Ligand binder design. Structure first.
Ligand SMILES: COC(=O)NCCCCc1ncc(CO)[nH]1
Length: 305
């Protein structure tokens, strides 16, 4: 259909502080959640059945990411570390030390041999997953790094920052290929590549989402209507039904846009605080949405389209 009809299926509770992110396992069976409560909780994507807690970080966690094979997780913490976890045993495999301030964002490359991290120390770091050692430190930005993402073949890294810049990096050399957004500001609160790796989705703290052509360096689409002036809110490409942009908002709603028409096609109501994080299931029309400390719940939504 030409509009989704996402409806609340489950409300997942357990976190005792603000939830920071939610990500579906690539294999679709797990939802992972991180929180300011220093915990990672694993949930069944289809029944929301609480699976396990993963503990070890000494301070709050801002991001969590899956390896390609759904077996490993990596988390970014205010304790200035990342931890690589084995999901099955729930054990810390490695602790990545090097950042001199909070680690805000992380992702595996598709090969899942590397992890990219963004920090308040204004650097992007590339880590070897096998040895937990830092391979490279990029003096990426002049303010905290809000987001990092590898493209589909893992040859580029896109990073965003409160310095109002979005930069793309050559993984192998760590040299800057392009400075996509060269504004004094507003703060770039989030960036990721599109699934084909042609486009960058970029959020700015003037309630604006923009789809960029990486090669051309030009803004293709603008999405508006939501509120985003304070928080680094994740945005997603929904690709299992109709082609949507998904994002949280500071008005406690999940916003869904038609990618092409830039039209608002649904607003999800239920959260009682800022929706900080959203995730689109890899195979089913299901959304995970996560909220800050007044709510602390994860909501699973299902659509027919
Ligand atoms: C400005 O600080 C926050 O927004 N705190 C909320 C928790 C962190 C949410 C987040 N972590 C990573 C991203 C985007 O890469 N967004």
């Amino acid at each position: 259909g030409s509009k989704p009809n996402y409806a609340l299926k489950f409300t997942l509770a357990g976190h005792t502080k603000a939830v920071s992110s939610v990500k579906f396992s690539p294999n679709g069976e797990w939802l992972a959640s991180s929180s300011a409560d220093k915990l990672i909780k694993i949930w069944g994507a289809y029944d929301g059945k609480f699976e396990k807690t993963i503990s070890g970080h000494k301070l709050g966690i801002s991001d969590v990411a899956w390896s390609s094979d759904s077996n490993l997780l990596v988390s970014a913490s205010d304790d200035k570390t990342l931890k690589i976890w084995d999901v099955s045993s729930g054990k810390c495999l490695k602790t990545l030390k090097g950042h001199s301030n909070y680690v805000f964002c992380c992702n595996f490359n598709p090969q899942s041999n590397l992890i990219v991290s963004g920090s308040f120390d204004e650097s992007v770091r590339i880590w070897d997953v096998k040895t937990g050692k830092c391979l490279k430190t990029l003096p990426a930005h002049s303010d905290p790094v809000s987001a990092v993402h590898f493209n589909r073949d893992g040859s580029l890294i896109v990073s965003s920052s409160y310095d109002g810049l979005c930069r793309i990096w050559d993984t192998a050399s760590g040299q800057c290929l392009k400075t996509l957004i060269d504004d004094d500001n507003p703060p770039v609160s989030f960036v990721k590549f599109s699934p084909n790796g042609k486009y960058i989705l970029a959020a700015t703290l003037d309630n604006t989402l923009k789809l960029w052509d990486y090669s051309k360096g030009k803004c293709l689409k603008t999405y508006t209507g939501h509120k985003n002036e304070k928080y680094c809110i994740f945005a997603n490409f929904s690709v299992t039904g109709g082609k949507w942009i998904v994002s949280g908002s500071e008005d406690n709603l999940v916003y869904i846009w038609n990618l092409q028409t830039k039209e608002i096609v649904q607003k999800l109501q239920g959260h009682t605080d800022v929706v900080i994080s959203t995730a689109c299931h890899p195979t089913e029309n299901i959304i995970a949405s996560a909220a800050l400390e007044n709510d602390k719940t994860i909501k699973l939504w299902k659509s027919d389209c």
